[PDB]
Design a protein around this ligand. Structure first.
Ligand SMILES: [Mg+2]
Ligand SMILES: [Mg+2]
Ligand SMILES: [Mg+2]
Ligand SMILES: [Mg+2]
Ligand SMILES: [Mg+2]
Ligand SMILES: [Mg+2]
Ligand SMILES: [Mg+2]
Ligand SMILES: [Mg+2]
Ligand SMILES: [Mg+2]
Ligand SMILES: [Mg+2]
Ligand SMILES: [Mg+2]
Ligand SMILES: [Mg+2]
Ligand SMILES: [Mg+2]
Ligand SMILES: [Mg+2]
Ligand SMILES: [Mg+2]
Ligand SMILES: [Mg+2]
Ligand SMILES: [Mg+2]
Ligand SMILES: [Mg+2]
Ligand SMILES: [Mg+2]
Ligand SMILES: [Mg+2]
Ligand SMILES: [Mg+2]
Ligand SMILES: [Mg+2]
Ligand SMILES: [Mg+2]
Ligand SMILES: [Mg+2]
Ligand SMILES: [Mg+2]
Ligand SMILES: [Mg+2]
Ligand SMILES: [Mg+2]
Ligand SMILES: [Mg+2]
Ligand SMILES: [Mg+2]
Ligand SMILES: [Mg+2]
Ligand SMILES: [Mg+2]
Ligand SMILES: [Mg+2]
Ligand SMILES: [Mg+2]
Ligand SMILES: [Mg+2]
Ligand SMILES: [Mg+2]
Ligand SMILES: [Mg+2]
Ligand SMILES: [Mg+2]
Ligand SMILES: [Mg+2]
Ligand SMILES: [Mg+2]
Ligand SMILES: [Mg+2]
Ligand SMILES: [Mg+2]
Ligand SMILES: [Mg+2]
Ligand SMILES: [Mg+2]
Ligand SMILES: [Mg+2]
Ligand SMILES: [Mg+2]
Ligand SMILES: [Mg+2]
Ligand SMILES: [Mg+2]
Ligand SMILES: [Mg+2]
Ligand SMILES: [Mg+2]
Ligand SMILES: [Mg+2]
Ligand SMILES: [Mg+2]
Ligand SMILES: [Mg+2]
Ligand SMILES: [Mg+2]
Ligand SMILES: [Mg+2]
Ligand SMILES: [Mg+2]
Ligand SMILES: [Mg+2]
Ligand SMILES: [Mg+2]
Ligand SMILES: [Mg+2]
Ligand SMILES: [Mg+2]
Ligand SMILES: [Mg+2]
Ligand SMILES: [Mg+2]
Ligand SMILES: [Mg+2]
Ligand SMILES: [Mg+2]
Ligand SMILES: [Mg+2]
Ligand SMILES: [Mg+2]
Ligand SMILES: [Mg+2]
Ligand SMILES: [Mg+2]
Ligand SMILES: [Mg+2]
Ligand SMILES: [Mg+2]
Ligand SMILES: [Mg+2]
Ligand SMILES: [Mg+2]
Ligand SMILES: [Mg+2]
Ligand SMILES: [Mg+2]
Ligand SMILES: [Mg+2]
Ligand SMILES: [Mg+2]
Ligand SMILES: [Mg+2]
Ligand SMILES: [Mg+2]
Ligand SMILES: [Mg+2]
Ligand SMILES: [Mg+2]
Ligand SMILES: [Mg+2]
Ligand SMILES: [Mg+2]
Ligand SMILES: [Mg+2]
Ligand SMILES: [Mg+2]
Ligand SMILES: [Mg+2]
Ligand SMILES: [Mg+2]
Ligand SMILES: [Mg+2]
Ligand SMILES: [Mg+2]
Ligand SMILES: [Mg+2]
Ligand SMILES: [Mg+2]
Ligand SMILES: [Mg+2]
Ligand SMILES: [Mg+2]
Ligand SMILES: [Mg+2]
Ligand SMILES: [Mg+2]
Ligand SMILES: [Mg+2]
Ligand SMILES: [Mg+2]
Ligand SMILES: [Mg+2]
Ligand SMILES: [Mg+2]
Ligand SMILES: [Mg+2]
Ligand SMILES: [Mg+2]
Ligand SMILES: [Mg+2]
Ligand SMILES: [Mg+2]
Ligand SMILES: [Mg+2]
Ligand SMILES: [Mg+2]
Ligand SMILES: [Mg+2]
Ligand SMILES: [Mg+2]
Ligand SMILES: [Mg+2]
Ligand SMILES: [Mg+2]
Ligand SMILES: [Mg+2]
Ligand SMILES: [Mg+2]
Ligand SMILES: [Mg+2]
Ligand SMILES: [Mg+2]
Ligand SMILES: [Mg+2]
Lengths: 71, 100, 92
RNA sequence: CCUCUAAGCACAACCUGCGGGAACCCGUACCGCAAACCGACACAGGUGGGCGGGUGCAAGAGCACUCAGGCGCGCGGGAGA
RNA sequence: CGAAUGCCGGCAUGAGUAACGAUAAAGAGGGUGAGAAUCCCUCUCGCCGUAAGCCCAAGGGUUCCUACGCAAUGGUCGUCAGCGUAGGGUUAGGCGGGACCUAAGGUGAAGCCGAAAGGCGUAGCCGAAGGGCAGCCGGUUAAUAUUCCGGCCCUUCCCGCA
RNA sequence: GAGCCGGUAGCGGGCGUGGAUCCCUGGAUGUCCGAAUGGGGGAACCCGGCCGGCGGGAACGCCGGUCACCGCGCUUUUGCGCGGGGGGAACCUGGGGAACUGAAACAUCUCAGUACCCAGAGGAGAGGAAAGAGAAAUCGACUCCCUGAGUAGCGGCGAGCGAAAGGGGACCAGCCUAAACCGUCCGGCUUGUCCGGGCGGGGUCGUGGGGCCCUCGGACACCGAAUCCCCAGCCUAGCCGAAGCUGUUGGGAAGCAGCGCCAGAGAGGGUGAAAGCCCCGUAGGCGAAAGGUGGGGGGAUAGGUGAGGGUACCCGAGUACCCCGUGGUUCGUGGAGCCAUGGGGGAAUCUGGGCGGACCACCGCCUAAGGCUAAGUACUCCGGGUGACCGAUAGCGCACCAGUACCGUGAGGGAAAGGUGAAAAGAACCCCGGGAGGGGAGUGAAAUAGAGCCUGAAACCGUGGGCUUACAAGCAGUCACGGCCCCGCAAGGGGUUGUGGCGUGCCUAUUGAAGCAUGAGCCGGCGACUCACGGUCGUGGGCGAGCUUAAGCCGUUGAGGCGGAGG
């Protein structure tokens, strides 16, 4: 995951506000999708959940830095 | 962090007690217990079966931990302590004589 | 944030009983509004919501050893969907 | 709530129809003259309001019996000083 | 340390003693169970019935329902429970509060006073079991119901049209 | 630099030498409450305005901005900027300010300007450059320590209270203004060449200083910050580190043995027991991209650099000063000065005015009514290092999930409770039982280390055995014989007690207690003549017409020296 993690910061850093907010919306739904399965059992690869929870944290963290001057 | 000691998943010599002499490998270092695994101090553990699953239970079982001190690393020679070399761009543990 | 309002389905004899009619019940944000929930449900499961009932669920007090505590308080929202409409995800 | 008029505004506005929409937050279990409330206790004490049937007795929420409901009181068995 | 009606703790004596909490009251046959006068059912019997019945407010805070249970808590017993573990359960435009009103009182623009802290105080504001305000009858759950469902009947907003 | 996903085991999933977890630094995110600040409110909950965005969205809802009050300054206002508000263990300053006590009663006095309440400040605070001290042809800010000194003095001269000077040390620092006088802007008005407000210049002193005149004037000539800048160093993670093998006893070596080795390291801790060389370390030596701190060292600034003679212009006002009421000081009405000041009266500008303990004259000392100022000093919530400090009734109330459980309406009170083993190897399975619990088996060196488990005393409750008791009567024992039982070959000894003799518990308090006077159910643990500074004897030493230092300084880091103020 470490590797596939050092990407976002880049593949996500170069997009802008309107590109992220929508990307994050997408992720947030996926997270719902998950926590929605466990409640019934299905999904069990926890690693997935926490893994997605932290992704959003990054997108937001990156979007927060962009909204401070730029253009 | 600081919690560090002398061995890692490599080959060591037991200087301990019941297995003084015995030699083994990857001790799956803890180090919350500051112990290692090796291939000795392996006791017989009773078993009912933590859940029918995998029914029957025997007495030959697993290998117990061993205080990290009871063991000594070895490479291209025998027992002996460990020193640390800079590798001109690194930090690798080398033995007084050999090298790892 | 629309997927932050609906935490999960409830799953229970009583809850399922609702499915016959457009009655799906969910565990939602303790602070969420009936109106907030209506929207959340509409965009999440693509449906037309026409009624929303909610009730608070106080956490059961529990004790593991001499250590006494409580479970987190919750909000339950049972959303009623427009005539003949099903929230696919909650069927099965 | 009805009414009066000031600023204003009278291509606003209010008022009556008729259509189409909108209508949030908290409480809601359970005990509640009590073993769940106040009295260290499953304490013969204390606890505000409403319903509280029938027959008889002069009357009544009194008294005796009983509807509906609820209970025989959370140690017993004997003995006949 | 032997003493301070010493201090903390432990264990004795009284003692198998007084007690087991209203004198409304019990009996039997089935059942369950390792075991129950004590749990379940049936049939008798007694008590309350301006109740010892039902409902609301306060206070209490899951004690509600259910499945496994019985070490302890139950003044005995326990298979039972207001007890242990776990899972369920409380659904509102119209019921009660809040997006209304003011009461004593409280707070407090102006303003007054006091070594400091702080004490007053007009307007205003807060303050309810008072004023205002549109839902009645049924049916459903193991557990909610003027809240869910059914029938019938209403209330405010917003927009359009006349 | 190899393991990680806290206390985490567990199902069930993942990440890491292409370098995670982890540690340090800086940022991001930071629901609600709380000074709490949009309004409200029963803290963590309700309800809004305005601007922008979500949804069919106008009703409804959510999201992001933003809206408290007060004080300064800009300035009418509209508004705008800075700030303020709370918290903080002690420490500090200021505003208020007890009593029990002591005086062997008690009121002045004491306790004490203490405890406490309030406001404020900060890493310190206060104080601070002489209107001083007080006798010295003297000293020269303030604070802090030692002496001075239990002195001088105060005191119902009772209890008791208690200075300063000087000397020896720590530390070091000195400045800015007000006003003469000159300029400027603004607003008054009588536009008066004046009134007063703000600016700027000028000016800061006591062998008096300054203003304004006139002489002298020859300074890229020296001073130089308490301000700013940059460095070193320091703080917030870390890193490198010498030297042992074998045998033997044993569950286990590190013990013991043989023969070695390192040492700028033989501090310490751990590893199955006791180890310089197995592990962590220790001596010695390295280390910061980032954030702090930082004249210690450099600089750069602001700021400061004169004599003569004239004038007599100015040197802080409801003040000085006097009286009345008080406080402060060693000073309690005293011969009562000095410093503050609530009241009344009320000046002068160095030909002035205060002080040297009433007052007066001499001789002197000093310049009030404006402000600022490092260091030396105080404290310890926090981090570290040490201990002739404690070791679970001790030590903090808490070694443990404690300011908790419980208590109280509330302020508030406030517990108990630590240890298996080297390693969970935590007892499969079988047998009795519903379970609990046991008996086997098995683990271990040990299971009477089997789990609230190291050791496990005493009181207390039992089972088995030995002696001995139902005609005896007692502070329960003791002396003497005797019987039975038990040891050893014996002499002798141990246990029990049948008769005989003799016998008034312990403590306390009292003239006097078995006392029918007090206290104690029994056992275990806690539980009371100390310490500091003075004094007086005595005593072991040193030196003795003398003895001895205190603070502090230099040294060490369990090393001591110096220091003559002073007694
Ligand atoms: Mg590196
Ligand atoms: Mg509701
Ligand atoms: Mg609302
Ligand atoms: Mg109900
Ligand atoms: Mg009653
Ligand atoms: Mg009643
Ligand atoms: Mg009872
Ligand atoms: Mg009662
Ligand atoms: Mg009554
Ligand atoms: Mg009648
Ligand atoms: Mg009658
Ligand atoms: Mg009946
Ligand atoms: Mg009872
Ligand atoms: Mg005692
Ligand atoms: Mg004694
Ligand atoms: Mg005692
Ligand atoms: Mg006791
Ligand atoms: Mg007894
Ligand atoms: Mg008896
Ligand atoms: Mg008796
Ligand atoms: Mg009797
Ligand atoms: Mg009896
Ligand atoms: Mg009874
Ligand atoms: Mg009875
Ligand atoms: Mg009767
Ligand atoms: Mg009757
Ligand atoms: Mg009656
Ligand atoms: Mg209630
Ligand atoms: Mg419970
Ligand atoms: Mg029940
Ligand atoms: Mg049952
Ligand atoms: Mg019982
Ligand atoms: Mg229960
Ligand atoms: Mg209101
Ligand atoms: Mg007031
Ligand atoms: Mg008022
Ligand atoms: Mg009002
Ligand atoms: Mg009301
Ligand atoms: Mg009403
Ligand atoms: Mg019910
Ligand atoms: Mg209906
Ligand atoms: Mg854990
Ligand atoms: Mg984990
Ligand atoms: Mg950080
Ligand atoms: Mg607020
Ligand atoms: Mg407020
Ligand atoms: Mg808007
Ligand atoms: Mg401040
Ligand atoms: Mg003070
Ligand atoms: Mg004071
Ligand atoms: Mg004070
Ligand atoms: Mg007194
Ligand atoms: Mg006295
Ligand atoms: Mg005094
Ligand atoms: Mg300092
Ligand atoms: Mg200072
Ligand atoms: Mg300092
Ligand atoms: Mg001066
Ligand atoms: Mg001096
Ligand atoms: Mg000037
Ligand atoms: Mg000047
Ligand atoms: Mg090293
Ligand atoms: Mg080493
Ligand atoms: Mg041994
Ligand atoms: Mg050896
Ligand atoms: Mg020896
Ligand atoms: Mg060692
Ligand atoms: Mg050692
Ligand atoms: Mg050796
Ligand atoms: Mg070092
Ligand atoms: Mg730096
Ligand atoms: Mg003059
Ligand atoms: Mg005085
Ligand atoms: Mg005086
Ligand atoms: Mg005066
Ligand atoms: Mg005066
Ligand atoms: Mg004077
Ligand atoms: Mg005078
Ligand atoms: Mg004088
Ligand atoms: Mg003088
Ligand atoms: Mg004199
Ligand atoms: Mg003088
Ligand atoms: Mg001055
Ligand atoms: Mg001055
Ligand atoms: Mg000052
Ligand atoms: Mg100062
Ligand atoms: Mg200190
Ligand atoms: Mg303790
Ligand atoms: Mg102990
Ligand atoms: Mg502590
Ligand atoms: Mg304690
Ligand atoms: Mg209470
Ligand atoms: Mg064995
Ligand atoms: Mg042991
Ligand atoms: Mg031990
Ligand atoms: Mg033991
Ligand atoms: Mg014993
Ligand atoms: Mg016996
Ligand atoms: Mg006889
Ligand atoms: Mg006899
Ligand atoms: Mg005798
Ligand atoms: Mg006496
Ligand atoms: Mg005597
Ligand atoms: Mg007696
Ligand atoms: Mg006695
Ligand atoms: Mg007496
Ligand atoms: Mg006594
Ligand atoms: Mg007694
Ligand atoms: Mg004792
Ligand atoms: Mg004792
Ligand atoms: Mg002495
Ligand atoms: Mg002496």
């Amino acid at each position: 995951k470490l590797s596939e993690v050092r990407k976002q910061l880049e593949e996500a850093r170069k997009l802008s506000p309107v590109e992220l907010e929508k990307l994050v919306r997408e992720k947030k739904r996926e997270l719902m999708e998950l926590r929605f399965q466990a409640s019934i059992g299905q999904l069990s690869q926890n690693h997935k959940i926490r893994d997605l929870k932290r992704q959003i944290a990054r997108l937001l963290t990156v979007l927060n830095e962009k909204r401070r001057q730029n253009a | 962090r600081v919690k560090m000691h002398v061995k890692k998943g490599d080959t060591v010599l037991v200087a301990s007690g019941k297995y003084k002499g015995r030699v083994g490998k990857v001790k799956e270092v803890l180090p919350k217990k500051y112990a290692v695994i090796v291939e000795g101090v392996n006791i017989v553990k009773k078993a009912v079966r933590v859940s029918p699953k995998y029914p029957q239970g025997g007495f030959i079982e697993k290998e117990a931990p061993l205080h990290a001190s009871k063991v000594r690393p070895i490479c291209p020679a025998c027992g002996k302590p460990t020193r640390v070399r800079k590798k001109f761009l690194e930090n690798g543990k080398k033995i007084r004589v050999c090298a790892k | 944030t629309a997927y932050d309002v609906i935490l999960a389905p409830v799953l229970s004899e009583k809850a399922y009983a609702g499915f016959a009619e457009g009655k799906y019940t969910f565990w939602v944000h303790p602070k969420a509004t009936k109106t907030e929930i209506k929207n959340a449900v509409e965009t999440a499961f693509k449906v037309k919501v026409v009624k929303v009932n909610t009730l608070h669920v106080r956490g059961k007090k529990k004790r593991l050893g001499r250590y006494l505590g409580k479970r987190p308080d919750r909000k339950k929202a049972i959303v009623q969907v427009a005539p003949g409409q099903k929230i696919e995800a909650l069927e099965g």
